[PDB]
């Protein structure tokens, strides 16, 4: 029994996880191409026409969100600083190490353990609360539509 559970533990932790990351990547490969085909759709359905004030208001927003990514002080630039701070060891701070007294190990174990058991409950209830709230928000939106 102990062996068969370790056989299935290794199936979840390696085989199923390798299928999950491959499906996560194919989701990105389909989302980038959902945008490819919808930009190409909107050009095709707008072709041979003037703009609208809403096409201007959204084309301005497409330019605003291009520049914040591409300017000298951009999101790209600031990720490239951190890429280089990390390469340099600007974030590998020195690892001081201690004897925690054998008098304090039982107090510390039970303090951290009571925090884990409290966090466990708060996460169990808040996970449900966000689900019940979005279910109520979905139901109310269709009730405001009949």
């Amino acid at each position: 029994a102990l062996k068969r559970m370790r056989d299935l533990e290794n199936h979840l932790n390696f085989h199923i996880h390798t299928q999950l990351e491959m499906m996560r990547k194919k989701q990105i490969e389909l989302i980038q191409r959902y945008i490819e085909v919808w930009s190409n759709l909107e050009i095709y359905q707008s072709k041979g026409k003037t703009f609208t004030t809403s096409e201007e208001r959204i084309m301005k927003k497409i330019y605003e969100l291009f520049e914040e990514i591409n300017q000298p002080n951009s999101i790209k630039s600031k990720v490239e600083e951190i890429s280089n701070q990390l390469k340099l060891g600007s974030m590998e701070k020195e690892k001081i190490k201690y004897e925690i007294s054998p008098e304090a190990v039982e107090p510390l174990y039970n303090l951290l353990k009571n925090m884990t058991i409290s966090i466990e409950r708060i996460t169990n209830e808040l996970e449900i609360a966000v689900k019940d709230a979005q279910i109520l928000k979905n139901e109310l939106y269709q009730l405001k539509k009949c």
Binding site: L30, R33, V37, K47, I62, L108, I119, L126, L143
Partner: protein, 146 residues
């Protein structure tokens, strides 16, 4: 008695091995459904693309040139976002390795620091999820009923 106690314990665990076989069949069906939804979105994108890329380029206008220029800028934004996400994930996954470099499954400093970091990132998620719940409350409360 102690052999009969351990025998009932093994039996009641084997009755729950039948439930682990249930979770494996549920997990298998999620892996079937996500695969064949991805292979269906793929197939409908190819069935939309093929309609756009069979129209004439005859009578494009100056508005259609600026429009093809800006709706392709939106496609460039998603691909540049994904380059930044992969590079910043390539920073986080190194910072995590850098703190874990001293891996010693007999230390206490490594384990106490990780249990407190797992607590910290969980408490940051609990705050973020209370904000998402409270802002969802406002949108329930402003969704007045007839």
């Amino acid at each position: 008695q102690r052999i009969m106690d351990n025998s009932q314990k093994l039996g009641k665990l084997m009755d729950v091995v039948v439930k682990l076989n249930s979770q494996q069949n549920a997990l298998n069906q999620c892996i079937d459904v996500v695969r064949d939804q991805q292979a269906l979105l793929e197939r409908s994108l190819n069935a939309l693309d093929s309609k756009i890329k069979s129209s004439p380029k005859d009578n494009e206008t100056t508005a259609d040139l600026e429009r093809e220029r800006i709706y392709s800028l939106a496609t460039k934004i998603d691909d540049d976002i994904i380059k930044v996400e992969n590079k910043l994930l390539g920073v986080v996954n190194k910072i995590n390795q850098n703190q874990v470099k001293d891996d010693n499954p007999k230390d206490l400093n490594q384990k106490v620091s990780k249990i407190l970091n797992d607590h910290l990132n969980t408490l940051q998620w609990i705050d973020k999820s209370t904000n998402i719940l409270q802002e969802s409350l406002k949108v329930i409360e402003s969704t007045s009923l007839p």
